[PDB]
Symmetry: D2
Subunit: 268 residues, 4 copies
Amino acid sequence: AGLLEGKRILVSGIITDSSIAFHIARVAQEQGAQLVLTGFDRLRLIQRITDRLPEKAPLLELDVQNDEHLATLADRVVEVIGEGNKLDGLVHSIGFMPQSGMGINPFFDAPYEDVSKGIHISAYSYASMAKALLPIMNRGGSIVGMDFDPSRAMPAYNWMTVAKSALESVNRFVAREAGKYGVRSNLVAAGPIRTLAMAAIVGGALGEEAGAQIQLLEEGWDQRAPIGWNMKDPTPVAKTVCALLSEWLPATTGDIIFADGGAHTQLL
Amino acid sequence: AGLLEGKRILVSGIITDSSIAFHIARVAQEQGAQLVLTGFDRLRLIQRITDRLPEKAPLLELDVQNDEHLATLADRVVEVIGEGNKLDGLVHSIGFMPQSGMGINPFFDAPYEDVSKGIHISAYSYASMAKALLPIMNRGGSIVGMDFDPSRAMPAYNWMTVAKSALESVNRFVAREAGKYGVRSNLVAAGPIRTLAMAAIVGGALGEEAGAQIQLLEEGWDQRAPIGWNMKDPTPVAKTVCALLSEWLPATTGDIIFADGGAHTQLL
Amino acid sequence: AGLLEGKRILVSGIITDSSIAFHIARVAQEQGAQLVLTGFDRLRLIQRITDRLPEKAPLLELDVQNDEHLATLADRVVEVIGEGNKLDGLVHSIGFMPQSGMGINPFFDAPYEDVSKGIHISAYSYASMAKALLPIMNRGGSIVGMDFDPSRAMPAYNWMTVAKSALESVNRFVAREAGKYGVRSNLVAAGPIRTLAMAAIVGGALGEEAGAQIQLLEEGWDQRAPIGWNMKDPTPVAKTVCALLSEWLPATTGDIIFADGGAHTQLL
Amino acid sequence: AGLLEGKRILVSGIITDSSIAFHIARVAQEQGAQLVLTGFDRLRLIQRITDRLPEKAPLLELDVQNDEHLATLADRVVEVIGEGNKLDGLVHSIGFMPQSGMGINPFFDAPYEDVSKGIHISAYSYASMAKALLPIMNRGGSIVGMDFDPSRAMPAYNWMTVAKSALESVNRFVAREAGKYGVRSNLVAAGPIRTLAMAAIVGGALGEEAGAQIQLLEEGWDQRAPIGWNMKDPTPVAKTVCALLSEWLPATTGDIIFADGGAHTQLL
């Protein structure tokens, strides 16, 4: 019997097998959970990736910018988990910022049209997925979103930092709504993880001043972290998400749990 | 000789004579500053209000959602302050959230179209005004924006809280850009102030559960504040903004100064 | 197989069966841990209390103000857990402030002799127990201390708040030392719990202005908490400590996990 | 007419002319304040230093660990400022930690006897000086203490960091007491300043791993600071203290104002 034995958990954000959500899903399945996965735009390709998980899982279409997708999401989840059954967990691992909003592009040069798209997908969608799925979540359930500590500004991350600040605020309000259902809402602030998306930004900064800053920024995490930080090892972050999905943190909500090696508690 | 003697300061956000920006402008003029004011959509009506300031000041049109207005703002400021002169200060006091995003309306029922408009006007515009005006600001200058502490969620303020969280993050990045010009960027987190806009929200909540919560929320500020809090007295907040516009906090930037009676430092 | 199956965990702070440490110990044993308990001054009486735990556990004398007790603690733990075995966990649940430092007594009237004793027992001892026991802790181990959020001042808690602020700082430095051993160090910031010690303070404030403030303070936790707060139910806090003692938060150190119903994330 | 024209301000902490308090005193006098200075143990030598201030000022003996000195302090201040006059400001700039508590000495090797002395002088004395002097402070007055941001641990600063965490908590409680008198209480968190005391620690770490860490730590402040940081220039910090002593931040209390170049708002 695993940490999440029999728990029904919806997991968003699986883009490649380097996605944090891929490893969250893997660990959750290793711990006995029954998953429902979401994706958009690349469904056949996503299924080829999710086939590499230890267990099978239904894959549902969800464009969080599509009101009709959100309006039918709960009904479509019930179709695959069965009449009279509800979700015990919801994992929000979708974060996106157009290219103008990150990397080597100057902070002032991101048009609001791009920033708005990023905040829609990265922050507002945490509330709209909770709105859609709380009516079919079980008392004692858990909503977990992925965060990257935006309390201090930093090179390159730029408007994605702003979107994470917005997400942290949204999480505190989602917690107020989720509490009416006996459901917790929390974020996991992870250290840097080498996803293909982040690698594309870092790679596109090679030889530029932003890339020098990014290198110093990344190297600082492992240095600051009293237990170190491995950007190529997403498993400690996935385990932390599963901790919040379990009932072992039953009095924590509206909150932020740091899975960052302790880096954010140290100046050097 | 006053605190801001001879300093040229652009002040946005004067809607009525209850606006915080009205009192910022008044105190700045009492302290010797030469002001440039901005407004949109009600220019003849705004001039009738700004006539009630102690000193005359040019009034320039600025819709922060209008790219052309922003593209010409610096040129139009130079037209009124004179060739070869620059601004010493910039006051951002524009905050707006459509009705769906505040008050008695449920948090989950605000469409993103409304939230996005509020974040554009309340948070992104802090960066786009800095982008427009830093090229004509003097070394040692000061950009100040108005904040309402969003670190903890609260009834009724809803998506405006999210917009303020975004603004705090934007301020930290504006500080990085402003530093290249020798310019500071800070926010003043004020206690609640009875503007006509906030009074309309509070008034529209009378008899509803949100209005009960708002009353308890407001009454808590004066109780928590070790020196009290008067929601009808914006002068302590205006003086604090003028402190940041002066050169008496010359090593503070990217930061948040609380003008709230100390309420946020006390639980009860 | 439980969450802490076979883990050897030292638990301090069991004074009565209302002590948080009593419930931490109970849940840890329910989850398969093998405990070593500490106490001072009332050893026969403490054994009568610890007899009421589900499983037997050795009880060792430890006055944290006694240098000789600390100098021999590791040797005495090895005597009871066996040659070649080490601890996997350390629970610090000792907090004490003389009567002058809490309750109805004015903040300014606590002599430093009393404040110093409280900070010795409540904060410095977290470092000195880590100093004594890290040499006999296993890689992947976990040190957990009990906290009460001191980020904002509050009535009655007075110098105990100051001692908790000191403890939070000590924890961040203990994490730097513990990391060299592959050991994490964290605090759990709990909501208010009706221990006999806290009840004695609250009871001694009945009819006084501090007691009125304490009542409003306590009632605010359950109100603010989106999932509520029960001061008579220490189990959610005990489960949270066990979460940190497990390996399900393996990238968290130097940190503070809130087991408070989410109260600290909400203003009202 | 200067920022503090005619204000009577007591200034503690002048050890050498590199002391932050020396520059606070100088700027305050440049701004028209009338000062009362305190010192202990080196009074003839301190007078030779305070002679180098722009204006004369009485020097009073104050060992903050001496209860009799504190019991008579208000009477002795009145003796020099005159019957019926009161103080408008109080500057606390005394910070001390025995050698075992900082620098290259291991964190775990500081005996509590040393830590306790440091916390007495660095943190508790902020409350006991407020207790002594609030009865002779004017409504609208201001108490300011010196801080060094202890929210994240760092090399070498060790137990002095713990003492500053304690001080920040004490400040929030002093604000509750000071509010009854119409008096504000705040701290200024400065960036690193090359006092003779800090230089002795840094100098004693030359060639050791702690000295390498200290160098990286110091160099990071100017790098992180969007407006830079000069450790040899205490004037920006002194001006910030004078800002809080004035009436230009009249709604700020129990709080922390950062005079650090903005370094603490940036990760890199």
